[PDB]
Design a protein around this ligand. Structure first.
Ligand SMILES: *[C@@H]1O[C@H](CO)[C@@H](O)[C@H](O)[C@H]1NC(C)=O
Ligand SMILES: *[C@@H]1O[C@H](CO)[C@@H](O)[C@H](O)[C@H]1NC(C)=O
Lengths: 390, 390
């Protein structure tokens, strides 16, 4: 009873949808003095009435936009912010980036027959088209027969297909890169590669050498929580065996798995403790080289102590503390009802100490919802906390 | 020397192109008094200058239209006719239908798990999207594993997948229809079908019954030259064996092949002699039913005697005969320089006998190119023949 708005459910920050279906932007509220809603397509006001196909909802501010007449969803891209308003304060939602899934065709590629000597390394670049999200890449023949992968032949994360050493039995099937898209079931293919393997004498043996990572070292930045992939692909004759190691300590036995044919290492859910230097060894027979990967880990803001709601009695004191850890250190910005706190209407019962807003002798005038935006180079955390007195 | 236009090479009537590449409409001429060209987008004049990206060519009227700035090829659809003009007459080209290849997404299909009893017939309709040309349909699992086909299970031309009788071992892989497009390498997929086979006692045996062709009889009209497919799919227990026959005569041993697992019969390059009644028998064990297909064959005009060029001496006689066989009988229409012969400028040396234009005492005034359009419900044959005197 008699309380400022509290958002219950809303859509994701990265709202991607296919052209096949209709638009459904969500935003559910909560509070006894019936909350009224209003969005803001981009950095300006959104008109629900002035546009026919768009419409709010009964007991909420959700959206439902179906295109029966015309209307292309490509004309609805942009950021969306929901506002649940009340006589006391205004609530905010994460600026939702509405985007449509794309399944682009490949560029005009006139591929020449690939002629390579037996035993020599070979890289066939896939170079897939953009699209949201990232497509799943796999290699099959033009006649739709799947290509078997092993220690000698496998694909990278970038989608390129690698040959440690080409055998005269590779001329059996051609090679076409396929791009499957997650949202809309669509596979896109590029022209097939034809191989011409040359027989000189037999197969000369040579020391191993890394193909995919260019050089002796590669650097990677991975955010906290996201998975971390390390790849070591090498060309040899008896085909190099990859062995993973970490400098100054063993690899997390529970948190690490060898994905490919030991060619790739995946550490899931990384933390600041996984930051370091990792390296792989390509053991052959004649020689053995090493690749050092420098992995630094940053972090999108995460709550250490999320600001909580205040339900006080007139005259009693309360605090709004908003702090989160992040790498680099996250900036704090408070907003009252969506309006910057630097330009907000004065209040003698309110005290701002940067990261903390303390209330002394709270009265029926300090009622409102406050927003805390922990701005970071890798992301943010928008918070909602209300102040209500009896 | 001193002669009316003669077209050497031109583009196909059904000119389909992908969005990936650029437009290249062709039209090459021939004649000493240098021929000048001009097209006609649809039933009106085409302006090469008024449009920037479009451009004719040096020693011809060919076209080359690349979109570097903007320009969507979807805005260039329509019929195109080339005109090679000369002081004596004007040549015509087939009205080229320029169209772009389409690879549409499937409609919103929320598929329920399919539950069927063991031994019962089952049809899973594919219902592919339009697109030009017709897509190649195949069935694979969602995990990209190919489905094996046999006498019991195979797909029709319509793309639908048929089960003569469902076995409890069908629950091994799911079923997703794939639509591969010829021009642009694109495969489109629909949601997978999940099977739930029910075991009652075992597998009851029943007489055969046709699944795909609805009823005891089906009618087909096939044009001359095009291939003719006949399909008989039947559901039985020991699985029906299809045997093909023709009423009143054997099937063309050299011109017929059994494509599927004897479920389909293909007669290539048909003629009026292949028109008749064909039927297949579905032999089982308990019973054996019959399906009669009535096949009538029509024909797009083909030359019996194509009009030839006249190279006469002033005073000598010559004829222009234009006749072609077709089903139904083709209409003849003559045009002088593209202008209807009913409204053309008079000529005392010219005689029109409907299908034949005879010239008596030809002089330096009857020089021109005449067009013969054998209009048929299934197509046409535009002809070019010139009259030149010394
Ligand atoms: C927080 O600040 C950042 C940087 O200006 C901005 O990108 C983000 O949208 C803000 N949070 C919200 C959703 O108000
Ligand atoms: C011949 O006549 C038919 C029917 O009017 C028409 O469709 C066709 O375009 C004509 N031939 C040409 C290309 O002039």
């Amino acid at each position: 009873l008699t309380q400022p708005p509290t958002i219950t459910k809303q859509s994701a920050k990265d709202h991607i949808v296919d052209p096949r279906d209709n638009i459904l932007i969500e935003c559910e509220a909560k509070g006894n003095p019936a909350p009224s809603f209003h969005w803001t397509r981009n950095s300006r006001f959104f008109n629900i009435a002035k546009d026919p196909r768009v419409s709010m909802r009964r007991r909420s501010g959700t959206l439902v936009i179906d295109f029966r007449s015309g209307g292309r969803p490509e004309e609805y891209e942009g950021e969306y912010q929901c506002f649940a308003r009340n006589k006391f304060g205004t609530a905010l939602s994460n600026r939702i980036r509405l985007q449509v899934s794309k399944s682009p065709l490949w560029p005009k590629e006139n591929l020449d027959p690939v002629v390579v000597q037996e035993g020599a390394p070979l890289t066939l670049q896939c170079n897939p088209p953009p699209g949201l999200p990232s497509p799943v890449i796999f290699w099959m023949s033009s006649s739709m027969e799947p290509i078997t992968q092993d220690k000698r032949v496998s694909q990278g994360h970038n989608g390129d297909l690698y040959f440690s050493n080409v055998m005269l039995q590779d001329m059996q099937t051609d090679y076409s890169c396929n791009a499957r898209f997650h949202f809309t079931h669509t596979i896109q293919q590029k022209n097939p590669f034809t191989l011409k393997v040359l027989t000189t004498r037999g197969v000369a043996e040579r020391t191993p050498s890394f193909m995919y990572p260019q050089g002796t070292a590669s650097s990677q930045m991975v955010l906290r929580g996201m998975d971390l992939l390390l790849e070591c692909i090498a060309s040899g004759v008896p085909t190099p065996d990859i062995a993973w190691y970490k400098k100054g300590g063993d690899l997390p036995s529970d948190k690490a798995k060898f994905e490919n044919f030991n060619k790739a290492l995946r550490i899931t859910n990384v933390s600041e403790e996984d930051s370091g230097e990792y390296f792989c060894l390509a053991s052959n027979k004649m020689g053995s080289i090493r690749h050092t990967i420098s992995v630094r880990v940053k972090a999108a803001p995460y709550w250490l102590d999320e600001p909580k709601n205040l339900i006080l009695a007139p005259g009693e004191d309360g605090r709004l503390v908003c702090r989160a850890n992040g790498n680099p250190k996250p900036t704090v910005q408070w907003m009252v009802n969506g309006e910057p706190l630097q330009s907000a209407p004065p209040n003698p019962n309110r005290e701002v100490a940067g990261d903390t807003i303390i209330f002394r002798d709270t009265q029926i005038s300090s009622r409102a919802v406050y927003q805390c935006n922990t701005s970071n180079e890798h992301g943010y955390l928008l918070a909602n906390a209300f102040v209500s007195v009896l």
